Amino acid sequence: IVGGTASVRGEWPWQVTLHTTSPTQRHLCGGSIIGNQWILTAAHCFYGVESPKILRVYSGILNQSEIKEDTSFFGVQEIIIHDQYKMAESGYDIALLKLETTVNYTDSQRPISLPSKGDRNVIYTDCWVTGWGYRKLRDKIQNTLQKAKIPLVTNEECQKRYRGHKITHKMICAGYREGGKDACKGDSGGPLSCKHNEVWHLVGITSWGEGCAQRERPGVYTNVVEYVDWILEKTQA
Ligand SMILES: COC(=O)Nc1ccc(-c2ccnc([C@H](Cc3ccccc3)NC(=O)/C=C/c3cc(Cl)ccc3-n3cnnn3)c2)cc1
Numbered sequence: 001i002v003g004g005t006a007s008v009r010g011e012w013p014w015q016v017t018l019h020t021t022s023p024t025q026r027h028l029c030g031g032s033i034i035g036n037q038w039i040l041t042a043a044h045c046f047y048g049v050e051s052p053k054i055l056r057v058y059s060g061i062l063n064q065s066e067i068k069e070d071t072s073f074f075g076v077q078e079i080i081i082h083d084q085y086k087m088a089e090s091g092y093d094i095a096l097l098k099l100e101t102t103v104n105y106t107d108s109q110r111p112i113s114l115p116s117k118g119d120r121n122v123i124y125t126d127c128w129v130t131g132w133g134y135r136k137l138r139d140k141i142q143n144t145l146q147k148a149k150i151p152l153v154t155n156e157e158c159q160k161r162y163r164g165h166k167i168t169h170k171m172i173c174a175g176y177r178e179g180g181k182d183a184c185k186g187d188s189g190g191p192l193s194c195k196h197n198e199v200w201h202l203v204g205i206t207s208w209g210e211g212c213a214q215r216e217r218p219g220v221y222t223n224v225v226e227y228v229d230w231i232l233e234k235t236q237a
């Protein structure tokens with residue numbers, strides 16, 4: 001997260017850090033708890049992933065330094081990638097992880113609601129991107145989960161910034177026209193969370209952008225509301 005600030009324990013209880021154990025253990029991507037055994041994340045995260053056996057989902061984590069040998073985690077039973085996915089910039093950048101066990105909800109780990117299909121005409125004005133990603137293009141993963149408040153940008157304005165890419169209605173953009181705050185490397189897969197009527201909704205999944213927090217180059221997120229039926233279909237299978 002560029003221009004982010006530290007989060008506190010229990011602030012983003014749906015946020016997870018997804019690690020790969022091959023060849024060595026490291027943070028791969030963010031994700032969000034959406035159900036008892038389900039994490040919603042980005043399909044692009046699994047490009048170099050051999051099988052679900054090499055993945056570990058860590059919930060209730062504020063600091064990466066808290067992740068050691070005896071740290072509790074959730075194994076992954078299945079990786080479900082949208083069957084139309086090809087590349088982040090062409091959309092369908094969405095995946096589910098079916099966990100090996102159910103998740104007992106606590107203050108440190110609980111699901112975020114999906115956006116309401118009735119809330120299509122909803123104007124979200126309290127949106128936040130979170131993650132352990134870089135603070136600039138050439139950086140390193142951050143120890144403490146970071147957050148940044150970012151405004152949504154219309155699809156029409158976003159399309160003007162990205163003449164070489166198709167910005168579809170299945171994408172949502174966010175960022176400051178004057179730059180400065182945005183997701184960056186290591187944040188993808190995590191949530192763009194909007195608080196509406198005192199309830200948090202998972203509005204976007206961090207997907208891609210041209211550079212990090214550059215002027216007139218908003219971040220591009222998967223528009224979760226456009227995938228509600230796909231998510232319900234796959235989570236009941
Ligand atoms: C010790 O462990 C480690 O060091 N771990 C560690 C270090 C680096 C990375 C990493 C590097 C590069 N890209 C990403 C992924 C893309 C990715 C590709 C393959 C697998 C996973 C993820 N893209 C983002 O995260 C976000 C991109 C992005 C998103 C928005 Cl919304 C706006 C602007 C963006 N950027 C444009 N250029 N950079 N970011 C992740 C992952 C893990």
Ligand SMILES: *[C@@H]1O[C@H](CO)[C@@H](O)[C@H](O)[C@H]1NC(C)=O
Nearest residue numbers: 072074100101102103104105
């Ligand atoms: C969840 O809580 C129940 C009751 O305390 C316990 O029996 C079970 O082992 C817990 N399961 C997980 C996955 O933590």
